[PDB]
Design a protein around this ligand. Structure first.
Ligand SMILES: [Ca+2]
Ligand SMILES: [Cs+]
Ligand code: NA
Ligand code: NA
Lengths: 91, 91, 91, 91
């Protein structure tokens, strides 16, 4: 479960990294940063896609990607962090 | 269900596209982009409505639109992407 | 329920409107806009509190206000919009 | 529960405050503000990490921190504010 969601998130982020570095001309690390803050809905206070292609892709990327990204964040903290902490509270 | 939520989201976004392109003078594609990042709470790092009408509308648009948009994103990934992936994990 | 959450949200937003217009010197409508996008996590791409008082308040305002605001948005679409639409789907 | 989540959130925010004030050179209060709006997904409309180290950390900070921060906000309003209000509605 967590593994599959992990891989799916990675692929999704790889896709965004490639798209933004190519179409919007961002440095790979910046493309990844934008993909990440966009899908987690944090957003970026400085960059907004400048091309129409970038805008359309971002719209679609958002609708398809948020569900997944949060599904992963959900399991990451519940099935991977909840116990590691919950078990530690055990005297 | 997914169909109704799909149509409802489209209508909501069409409404925003028309409003922002008319009152805030945004190019239609930019009006749609702003409507989308606003309702998914991603936000835009460059544009904020400049008119009081735009500000009041955005406030109302947000309260009425987020519930719907996330209800659609929820079903989109759960009733349309969960299986297409879950079924594929089947050896 | 919806009424109480409605009033609670109004009071919370009134509080923010007063704070930002006074401490950060924003026009009342802008103070309200910032309070709204902040609590719904949409965020504003142009304004960030400039005073330390504004920053500390925003931090506290966020932790105390998001839970409420989303509790209201949740009931607004589920107990006030779900039926008005769900009932309409009835042939 | 609320106590543990409280402490965990504090530690997480302390970590961000230290990181951003050191690597991105932000005033401690600004580092804390950025950590807070980032983890609650509100985002900041003016600042984005400028160093690659800052970008990578923010990406990881987000994935590890949102789950926790919202788990705390969830219990804060449900197990600490819901009653204080719900009980008051009692004639
Ligand atoms: Ca900006
Ligand atoms: Cs945001
Ligand atoms: Na934002
Ligand atoms: Na958000």
């Amino acid at each position: 479960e967590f593994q599959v969601l992990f891989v799916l998130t990675i692929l999704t982020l790889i896709s965004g990294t490639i798209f933004y570095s190519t179409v919007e001309g961002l440095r790979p690390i910046d493309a990844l940063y934008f993909s990440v803050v966009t899908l987690t809905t944090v957003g970026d206070g400085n960059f907004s896609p400048q091309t129409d292609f970038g805008k359309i892709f971002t719209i679609l990327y958002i609708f398809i990607g948020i569900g997944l990204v949060f599904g992963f964040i959900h399991k990451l903290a519940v099935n991977v962090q909840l116990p590691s902490i919950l078990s530690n509270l055990v005297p």
